[PDB]
Design an enzyme around this catalytic site. Sequence first.
Site, PDB file in Angstrom:
ATOM      1  CB  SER A 103      32.164  45.223  44.744  1.00 53.53           C
ATOM      2  OG  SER A 103      32.987  44.781  43.680  1.00 53.53           O
TER       3      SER A 103
ATOM      4  CD  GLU B 197      37.415  37.478  44.678  1.00 54.38           C
ATOM      5  OE1 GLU B 197      38.148  36.671  45.280  1.00 54.38           O
ATOM      6  OE2 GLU B 197      37.237  38.649  45.074  1.00 54.38           O
TER       7      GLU B 197
ATOM      8  N   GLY C  42      32.132  43.151  49.838  1.00 51.19           N
ATOM      9  CA  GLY C  42      31.841  42.397  48.616  1.00 51.19           C
ATOM     10  C   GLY C  42      33.071  41.869  47.898  1.00 51.19           C
ATOM     11  CB  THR C  43      33.435  39.415  45.085  1.00 51.68           C
ATOM     12  OG1 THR C  43      32.562  39.962  44.088  1.00 51.68           O
ATOM     13  CG2 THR C  43      32.705  38.320  45.859  1.00 51.68           C
ATOM     14  CB  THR C  44      38.089  41.932  43.934  1.00 51.84           C
ATOM     15  OG1 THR C  44      38.523  41.643  45.270  1.00 51.84           O
ATOM     16  CG2 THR C  44      38.920  43.084  43.372  1.00 51.84           C
TER      17      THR C  44
END
Lengths: 111, 235, 243, 250, 241, 240, 230, 231, 244
Positions: free
Chosen positions: C74, C46, C29-31
Amino acid sequence: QFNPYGDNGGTILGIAGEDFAVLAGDTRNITDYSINSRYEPKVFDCGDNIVMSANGFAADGDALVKRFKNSVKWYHFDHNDKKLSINSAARNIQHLLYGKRFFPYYVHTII
Amino acid sequence: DRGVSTFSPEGRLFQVEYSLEAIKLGSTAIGIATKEGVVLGVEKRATSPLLESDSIEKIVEIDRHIGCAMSGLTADARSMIEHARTAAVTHNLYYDEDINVESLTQSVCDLALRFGELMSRPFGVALLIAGHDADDGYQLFHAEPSGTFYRYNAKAIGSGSEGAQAELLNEWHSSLTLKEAELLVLKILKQVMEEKLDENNAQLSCITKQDGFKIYDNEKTAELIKELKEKEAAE
Amino acid sequence: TGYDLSNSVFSPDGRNFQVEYAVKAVENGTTSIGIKCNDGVVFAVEKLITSKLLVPQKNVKIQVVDRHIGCVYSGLIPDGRHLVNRGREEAASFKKLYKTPIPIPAFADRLGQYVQAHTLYNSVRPFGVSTIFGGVDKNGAHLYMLEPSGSYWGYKGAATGKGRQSAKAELEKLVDHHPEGLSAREAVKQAAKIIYLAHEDNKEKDFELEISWCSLSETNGLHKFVKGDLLQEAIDFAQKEIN
Amino acid sequence: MTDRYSFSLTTFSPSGKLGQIDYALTAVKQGVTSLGIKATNGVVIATEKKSSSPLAMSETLSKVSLLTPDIGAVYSGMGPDYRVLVDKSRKVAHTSYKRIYGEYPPTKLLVSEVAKIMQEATQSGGVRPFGVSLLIAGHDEFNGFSLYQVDPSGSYFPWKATAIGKGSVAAKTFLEKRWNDELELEDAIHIALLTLKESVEGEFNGDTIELAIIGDENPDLLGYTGIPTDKGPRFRKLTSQEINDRLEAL
Amino acid sequence: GYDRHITIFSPEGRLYQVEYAFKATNQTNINSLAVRGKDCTVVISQKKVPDKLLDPTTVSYIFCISRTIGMVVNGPIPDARNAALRAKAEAAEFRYKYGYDMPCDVLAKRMANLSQIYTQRAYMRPLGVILTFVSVDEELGPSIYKTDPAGYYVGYKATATGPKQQEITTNLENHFKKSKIDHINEESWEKVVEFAITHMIDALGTEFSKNDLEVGVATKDKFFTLSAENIEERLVAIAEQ
Amino acid sequence: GYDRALSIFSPDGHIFQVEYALEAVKRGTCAVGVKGKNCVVLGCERRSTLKLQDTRITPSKVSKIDSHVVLSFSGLNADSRILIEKARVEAQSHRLTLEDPVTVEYLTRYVAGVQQRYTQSGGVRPFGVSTLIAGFDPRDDEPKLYQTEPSGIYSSWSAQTIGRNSKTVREFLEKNYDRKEPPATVEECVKLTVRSLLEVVQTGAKNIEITVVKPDSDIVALSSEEINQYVTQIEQEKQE
Amino acid sequence: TSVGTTIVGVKFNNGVVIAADTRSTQGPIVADKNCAKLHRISPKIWCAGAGTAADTEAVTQLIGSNIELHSLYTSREPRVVSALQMLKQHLFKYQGHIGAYLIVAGVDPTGSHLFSIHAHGSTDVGYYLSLGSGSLAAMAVLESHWKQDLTKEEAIKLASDAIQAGIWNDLGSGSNVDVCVMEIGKDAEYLRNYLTPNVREEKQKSYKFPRGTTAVLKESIVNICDIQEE
Amino acid sequence: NNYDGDTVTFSPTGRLFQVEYALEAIKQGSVTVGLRSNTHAVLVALKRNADELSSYQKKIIKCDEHMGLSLAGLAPDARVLSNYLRQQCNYSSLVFNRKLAVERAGHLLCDKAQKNTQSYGGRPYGVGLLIIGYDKSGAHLLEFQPSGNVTELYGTAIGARSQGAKTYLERTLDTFIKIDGNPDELIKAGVEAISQSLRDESLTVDNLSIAIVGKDTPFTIYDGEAVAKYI
Amino acid sequence: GSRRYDSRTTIFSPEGRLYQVEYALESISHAGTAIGIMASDGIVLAAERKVTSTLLEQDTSTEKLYKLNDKIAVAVAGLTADAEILINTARIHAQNYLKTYNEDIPVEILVRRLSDIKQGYTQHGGLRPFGVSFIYAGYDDRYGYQLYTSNPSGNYTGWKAISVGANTSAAQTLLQMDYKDDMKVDDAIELALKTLSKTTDSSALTYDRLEFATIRKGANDGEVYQKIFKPQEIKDILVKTGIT
Ligand SMILES: [Mg+2]
């Protein structure tokens, strides 16, 4: 003891002409010897060229009209936007009312 | 093993796709819609000569204005018919009117995907639902175990379906009479059936606005078979 | 073998492989990050701009629980929403019975026990999210991070997702260089920088920055989103540091 | 969630074996030896207190348990399974008998209830069988003294004397040579201690041996006086000192 | 080989899922120790905070179950908190139903029974934890009762749990072989804590700062955990003799 | 509750549990039904592997569902009892609510419906039973004979057989039964039924059961000697 | 509920004593002249009941049964506060419909205890208590002679004197005095018919009939034995 | 592979294959396009027939006077999810006298789809949805995936060959967002967008399905000769 | 989920057989032999206990022969614990019938009830079947003396003489050879013991390895008596019939 019913007064009148119909009602709403409102609409346009009034106990009256309006909406969803004919609306309202046979809507309905 | 509601890598439900294979093994059923009515015809396919063929019931009334033909595992169709009849009658009770053919079909198709681990598997039968209402006139629908239903001008289901559908592709036009449709169903049934077509191993029916749904007598169908034979020998 | 095919099965190591596989979805996943400041907490995430057709500032990721708790996660976004929905039910029942808004440690355990419960049976799947959450209560600011196993601890700074290693290193610098503490406004600026720095692991597509905060002095202990001028100021500060 | 294991986990194999029951009996075989001997005026049940650690207080672990004032139980196999069975056995003696008839159940019927619970763990959905064999000793007015064995399958048998667990085969042969129908309770205790010594490796004393009897009524253990018909429990656990006294006359 | 996936018997009469739950117990790489004084029961546990981003005050494996009962856990924290929440609920319910505080040994038995159920019922997995309950019971006095994933429990004069439990156990065994008594003959709990820390240092062969340990103390009518500064005072006294 | 889908479709569109239920029917003792002009006869095979049997008390193969309808079967005996009980309850329920006894077709449709239900309900297997249901509708003199099978399909038959070696006796019936002129008397119908079983049975001793159902609830089971007289007369005509 | 009964409880130096009369009534009619109203919950926890007699007996046996199972589970001797808590929560749940009014007394490792409990589930603590229709007569004696630091002999005397006040002055009470003494570190001693001040005098006449006085239509042996062999 | 037997099982790389297979059903479905300006929102859908005798499967479903969607994938699943939306729109009006916000409708659909991805016995939904609506914050377009992921967009496309329409909308972004107060031009842009996804076949009178909702425009579906104007 | 571990106890094989029923019958074939013989003046039940010990308390032991009511008894072959579950249910059914109609339950009605319970476990529930075969010996005033058997499938049949458990093939042949319709109880007693003596896997047939029962109208006048034989009484009848 709690009394779930009340009387909001009011008088309604429906007359069928040759190619028209009228549904009339006074706009006064009351309890006992007091006036709640001098203008509280009691006759409603329910769509599909149908007008309705449920006179008596206004809470039940508002609940029934609301549920019938809702029934018109779902009739359109379920049956390809078919117009709800006045005879079909009448039979539908019978079932709405008889559903509470043992705890009735305390109203006299006219469409 | 594996879930009953599992998707294949292609995005299809295994059980639904497999039930479609069972329907391919079923006896042929054909429907043709015209502006004068909709005709429904079936192959009876008795397993033995001692089996009394008029007890084979593959065409069924749902209401006065709606009829139905089946193909596949025909025992599965009984609860579908029971539901259809109940839905048709219930709507009349609630609304003091006939139910639309599409609405009836949609109600039947709502049962289809109610399976899992509700019933343990999909239905193994396909239905041709034919009828008439005031809003959309004469209609023919094909109800599948996937829950999908298509409207058709003409449709064949069962073992001889792709050969029959190709034949229906050529023969159907928007000006067909009821009599022309009757002969056309008989002609195509005769083409795809293993045994020779007669009034005992095939059945006809129709739905008209005036008379409603009617299953044809064996005597009535026998005459239409004789009329077919003569007109094919006429050229 | 076969120990990894079913949730709640102990491997011969004493491991639950299905939980470890859920962590892989989190790492994909995204940060997202969290920074504990002097009188509150700051959350940032993010948001990958997959296409120009995404409406800017509309697909909001950070979620509020009650009025004093913020949550960001995330991994599988739907799993995170499911966890927050439960958290909102937990917070509501706590406040219903005890009147006071749920304390952050109390709330942490409610989420923890629920996530842990999804490692007890083979009829459920573990959560595919790591959740960073916190806020202000009667005892001050609290920041937590919760893993698919149900494991959670209190944090000074927290990070998860694809750029977690980068973010963690940045957070560790802040802890060392500020033993006295960080202000809420400083933490917002620092959060913007860290997300921009962590975006190197996701450098292919451009992104959108989203920040929120709860602070006793800056937001009266309520969770609020950083918007407009304060957000632009943080973006400018972040862009200046990467160049 | 929900328990979705509504199917049997014990099933018949092609040879007609119920695998999980056989494997439960294997677990019982690995268990520490316990025994029971019936005398004319009493019954004795005994086992070894195999302490898992010397830091553990083995007096806090009771392998011999009172079920009713006149009925006691000992086991071989899985301890935790035994402990919960003792809780269920105690409760069922009240719910299915004492709250109905105003008296404690006879030995054979309590055994029957414990057996039923063990049978159900062999057929019910989503459970394994209990990994224990029980020896239940008891007395009641109309049946006198009795001793029963209950196995993981739910099968139970009455014994004059028997042994279960680790060294049961050798212990049963030892008991066959010594048992007769004229034994007094003290003779049975003596034979129990002799038999148990063979299967014990290390220390053999009152602190490493657990032994109880079903014998005479103990009015000193009743806790009250004034009702002539109430004369006290027949179950009595021997003390560490009482065992050592009989180990000198061994 | 599905007899290794759920809690059913293997051909040898073993429960592999229970055995593997015992292995999960040591995943934290933490050792704990419990001893009894005259008037108290002391439990110490190693504290390891490997990440600088962690809030060290929230890292704990010692729980205050009730006013009188304390519990240290050996195993992963999610299962530890699962057991902690349940034990707290059980202890509170007991007091409500029976009108007196739940004894340490009774709570241990109850949690042991719950664990036993997970070894017999297939849909429930065992918890990968060993639970050491401590108190000063109003009837039995200083008490240590320990529960494991098999559903086994027993009372202890003293006990140890973790990867290096054997070293600590033997060290404790040797001390009680000398003294020939079932407890630490000391008046104050402070000195019993000092004994506990000293013998863990000897057994493990490692020195401890104030942040490397976690301490719980049970006295009559209360259990409590020591702060880092309380532990520091304890470490200073150990070093000064 | 146990909810497992035991009856499911295979890639080739078959439901194997239903098809394997038919294999249980194939194993069952042979049953045969023949309708005359004013009667129906149900014949049943009794395997002589079991002697020392008490024939007074042993469950008979033909069962009365009501005073005017009977049911025989091939397949799992225990399974058949459940269908028989349900049918008997429904027969009384129909009389109670409709104030008229069941038609043979209605009773068949009900039993077939129960069988179908057990092919797409969770946690159950199909009945390993096929049935022959025979009788006369109330105030009607037209003979009725129906057949059901595990899948739940049913149909009417002039004559039919089910069970082991039913392929052979159906072969016999297909060449010996004329539709334009069915067995005009009870004698002729019973004779044709006994003849059909003699193609398969072995000894004509206690191996053949015969039950005759006539209109207006007139049902009677033939004895050993009465059947033995048919067996005797058939082979004496055959010696030619 | 049932009108009737005199029951008392009295604390003393090293324990507690309870006492009761022995008359049970149905309306104005004496059903049993030597009823046992002192019930055992556990060896050293005893209670006495007024009100609906079946309810006092039933609620005592149920809690007594659960107390025994609790004692076995915990390896501890039962406490009076446990009996009290279990009794009150049961009675409260049934909203007074279980007509049990009890005086609960006993000794346990915590000490000696004396409580009262009322059918709706309320409880009270005291050094001296009385319940039943004769409770006012009994309480009059208790309020006149009770003091702090009573001996065992003084408490037995006071308790039985309080029951006597009920016996003589309350129509709902009569016949004999039952007593149970629960002392710390001792077996509870149940003293059935501790006092017997109401023995009926000899009748003026014997009413034994001459044999054959009653007219008989038929005689027959009743088979109480099982079906016989051979 | 060994991890695609049910929705309750993660793969060793943290994937949910049953959800991915459900996503694959959408790709097999017929193309449908969604786009909006600041005044209106438009759905355009290419309907698919079985053969020349059959009808063209309907793609657009009305949920309320101010909201509706178009589908791609399993049609019965769209009927279930659209029925749920109808109910939620209806609950909001009856209880709160409030028209359900399009963003909140997206949240509800996400949560409903999520429950089918974490539990045993069930299956993911096998359909993608494009929801358009006009509420108190103007025009909106949403994209629903049965993974649970819901996304607010200016424009998008789902189904077979949807990539062509999606690239076109990405180019035209600055033009079609400005088409305010002109319903016909916004539909033209949608019809031109969906044309970038056609091969071999073209838009006919029973092939094309168009829906629109806006400032003073209730959600209305156009089929048959009503879309000949745009062919 | 859980499906993985499901044995599916209620499915057909490709041949149309019930796996678990067949395997339960295999289990029963290793159980001690039980024999029932019906005579004109009564019924005999004889059964062999499985390899016993000298320390087994025989006079208080019961593994084979059970009383259902005063008129009906059963002989068991298979899992004893499974049998007791069913036996208690049968005892309750008999009393339910007696309470409802004020008449003793006819033998077949009881047998049908128990057999239907067995049948249920083969068709639904996903549980293993009962590994038990019964021989029912009973009397009622409709059919008089009756013998039935039921097995794990829930199928039941009536018999003049029958065996269940081990060596039924050999036992049934021996019974078929010597059984006659006009036989009496005392003759049937001898036949049963002789049959067990020949079919037994033990070296010799002794009293301590047997359970024995008779249902006789040898009860004083028009009534029926059940006699569960005591160890000494089995020893005497073994000497009388000349087996020991
Ligand atoms: Mg388990």
